Amino acid sequence: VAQGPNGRALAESMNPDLLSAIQQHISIERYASVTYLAMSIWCAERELAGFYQFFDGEAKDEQSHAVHFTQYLIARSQSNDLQTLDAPRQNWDSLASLMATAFQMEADTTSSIQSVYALAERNSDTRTTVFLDPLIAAQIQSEDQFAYLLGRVKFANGDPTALLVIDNELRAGQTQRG
């Protein structure tokens, strides 16, 4: 039995380029987390309590995704390399602009997973594609959800009354088409 780079027994070696791609993706998940924290704060500063609660939870969930990836590297006997984390964006001129950035963040998270996926396929790493499959499925749901929240906020067309109604929807947990 061979030992993997992290010292554990090695079921199958991993291409170093794929390993690097996964380590970078963990940073993307962590960056999504702190981005959603910054968004939660921006909303709290404007008394948009439902949006604050929503993004506070999204921040925690993205962190959980990052940890989920660290556990996969452990399971593959690969080294983790937790990286320096950039500061998030923190300023927006409107809730619609914030929601556009949020949607882009979600879509960019999927693109990162897709890039890891393509590298795993090039390397015939079926463990990794199988690991990623349910994460892509979750991303479809999150993209659908963020398109819903962004589209609903855009429909409000900057009317504070409409934004208060939507804020109350989010506080109540009404965050998807359902």
Q: Taking every pair of C-alpha atoms in the chain, what is the biggest distance, in angstroms?
A: 65
- Residue from 94, 111, 114, 141 touching Cl ion (CB under 5 A): that is 94
Q: How many angstroms separate the CA atoms of 163 and 171, rounded?
A: 12
Whichever of 29 and 167 has its CB closer to Fe ion, that residue is: 29
User: Binding site annotation covers 62?
Assistant: yes
- Distant-in-sequence, close-in-space partners of 1: CB < 8 Å, separation ≥ 6: 9, 10
DSSP state of 3: B
Q: Which is nearer to a second copy, 11 or 16 (by Cβ)? A: 11
CB of 153 to Na ion, least distance (A): 14
Distance, in Å, from the CA atom of 176 to the CA atom of 27, rounded to the nearest integer, reads: 27
Site for Cl ion in 142-171 (CB under 5 A): 158
How open is the CA angle 65-67-69, to the nearest 5 degrees? 75
State which H helix or E strand residue 61 sits in: helix 49-75
Query: Alpha-carbon distance 10 to 159, whole Å?
Result: 58
Q: Candidates 7-15, 66-74, 87-95, 131-139: pick the segment binding Cl ion (CB under 5 A).
A: 87-95
Among 87, 157, 161, 178, the residue binding Na ion under the rule CB under 5 A is 161
Q: Is 133 among the residues that bind Fe ion (CB under 5 A)? A: yes
- Select 75 or 165, whichever has its Cβ closest to Fe ion: 75
Question: In the structure encoding, which two tokens stand for residue 116, read together?
Answer: 């890891």
Question: Any known ligand binding at 68?
Answer: no
Nearest residue (CB) to a second copy, 17 versus 131:
131
What is the binding site for Na ion (CB under 5 A)? Answer: 159, 161
What is the binding site for Cl ion (CB under 5 A)? Answer: 89, 94-96, 101, 158
